[PDB]
Amino acid sequence: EQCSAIVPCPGGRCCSQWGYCGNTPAYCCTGCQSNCEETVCGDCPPNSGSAGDGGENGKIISRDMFDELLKRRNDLDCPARCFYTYNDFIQAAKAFPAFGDTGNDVIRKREIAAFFAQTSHETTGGSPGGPYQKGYCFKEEVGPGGGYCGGGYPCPDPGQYYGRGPIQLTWNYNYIFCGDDINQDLDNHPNLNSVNGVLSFKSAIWFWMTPQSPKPSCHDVMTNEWAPGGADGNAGRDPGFGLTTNIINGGLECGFGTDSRVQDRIGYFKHFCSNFGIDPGNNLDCYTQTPY
Ligand SMILES: *[C@@H]1O[C@H](CO)[C@@H](O[C@@H]2O[C@H](CO)[C@@H](O)[C@H](O)[C@H]2NC(C)=O)[C@H](O)[C@H]1NC(C)=O
Ligand SMILES: [Cl-]
Ligand SMILES: [Cl-]
Ligand SMILES: [Cl-]
Ligand SMILES: [Mg+2]
Ligand SMILES: [Mg+2]
């Protein structure tokens, strides 16, 4: 839309020198008239290098491999440009030592590909049908709408539990449980997941690693540590990438045939599997799985 210093953007974006609303350096930096500097202006900071060669997990996903998977995330039209770094990812992963470090190298690669595929989908700046190089374009839900509070739990900030970070962590209960396990008060300070890159990655790896009955963890599914428990066989829940989509968002995406969101998750996964030189494995969709 149009805007000026005296008419800010209704939805809160930067008002450019020429009076249009947006979230890129052209709107937000030089000459910006209102609600400025909401994205980084200029070159990203140089790498901290605090992860070095990445350690144990860096044997599966090097610095270069991380930046090849997430090739276009620092395009000028990604609002999260410069936020997501290899050094923060490796520091976060060190807090969940089994992640990407369980099983033979084919399983470790496929776990990491699946994790980056699901988080790339949650934060996608790409177009339906691909290609699949612009994961991790965003770090906050674009139009935060409904209160995201399950009434069972404390809710000091009813409008503030919208999606943040690589898995777009949402709902008061997930901020409670995640914050508890990573020693952060995310219930009272939920913006930590969009202002601190290490905490942001920790929240996504936390979700990936944590069973929440009846759901197994995405980790145990992808590393061949889950077996269908009874109700599961006749709900159609078979081990593979599709079951991680069911765990993440199956109530809205699974059990009713071809769906564009599911296809986008699978598209990122196949692309990342090709980069890693591995096969995606079996049961890639959840089209005939009952949701949890
Ligand atoms: C991002 O968050 C982390 C964790 O809250 C910060 O690093 C920790 O800071 C505490 C003190 O505040 C230290 O005792 C820890 O040793 C730090 N490292 C950890 C927990 O791994 C970090 O400083 C934050 N980054 C920014 C830029 O604010
Ligand atoms: Cl980086
Ligand atoms: Cl395998
Ligand atoms: Cl769900
Ligand atoms: Mg979302
Ligand atoms: Mg964003």
Q: Which atom of ligand 1 is nearest to the CA of 198?
A: 1
Domain covering 140-206 assigned CATH 3.30.20.10 in the classification: yes
Q: Ligand 4 centre from 292 Cα, in Å?
A: 6
Nearest to 221 by CA among 88, 93, 115, 72: 115
Give, in order, the Cα–Cα distances in Å from 176 to each of 60, 95, 267: 31, 18, 32
Nearest to 22 by CA among 79, 90, 98: 79
Kindly give the pairing relationship between strand 21-22 and strand 14-15: antiparallel
* Domain segments of the chain as ranges: 1-42, 52-138+211-292, 140-206
Resolution attained, angstroms: 1.7
Q: How far apart are CA 18 and CA 23, in angstroms?
A: 14
Classified by CATH at the fold level, domain 52-138+211-292 comes out as: Lysozyme (1.10.530)
Show which residues are catalytic: 122
Torsion of CA 228, 229, 234, 236, to 10 degrees: -30
Tokens representing 7 are 């008419």
Ligand 1 pocket, 196 CB below 6 A?
yes
Nearest to 17 by CA among 42, 36, 39: 36
By the 8 A CB rule, do 43 and 26 touch? no
Nearest to 272 by CA among 163, 115, 43: 115
Q: What's the farthest any 2 CA atoms get from each other in the chain?
A: 63
Ligand 1 pocket, 92 CB below 6 A?
no
Q: How far apart are CA 221 and CA 34, in angstroms?
A: 47
Cβ–Cβ contacts within 10 Å for residue 269, how many?
A: 27
What are residue 208's phi and psi, to 5 degrees? -65, -35
By the 8 A CB rule, do 218 and 227 touch? no
Residues, beta carbon < 5 Å, ion ligand 6: 79-80, 138-140
Ligand 1 pocket, 90 CB below 6 A?
no
Q: Ligand 5 centre from 214 Cα, in Å?
A: 23
By the 8 A CB rule, do 140 and 163 touch? yes
Element containing residue 68 per DSSP (H, E): helix 63-69
Tokens representing 200 are 């942001």
Give the residue, by CA position, lying nearest to ligand 1 atom 25. Answer: 196
Give me the amino acid identity at 248: I
Ligand 1 pocket, 198 CB below 6 A?
yes
What are residue 140's phi and psi, to 5 degrees? -135, 140
SS3 149: coil
Residues, beta carbon < 5 Å, ion ligand 5: 163, 168
2 pairs with which residues across the strands?
20
By the 8 A CB rule, do 95 and 84 touch? no
* Total number of residues shown for the chain: 292
Q: How far apart are CA 87 and CA 53, in angstroms?
A: 9
Q: How far apart are CA 129 and CA 231, in angstroms?
A: 34
Question: What's the CATH superfamily of 1-42?
Answer: Endochitinase-like (3.30.60.10)
Ligand 1 pocket, 199 CB below 6 A?
yes
* Cis amide bond preceding 131, omega within 30: yes
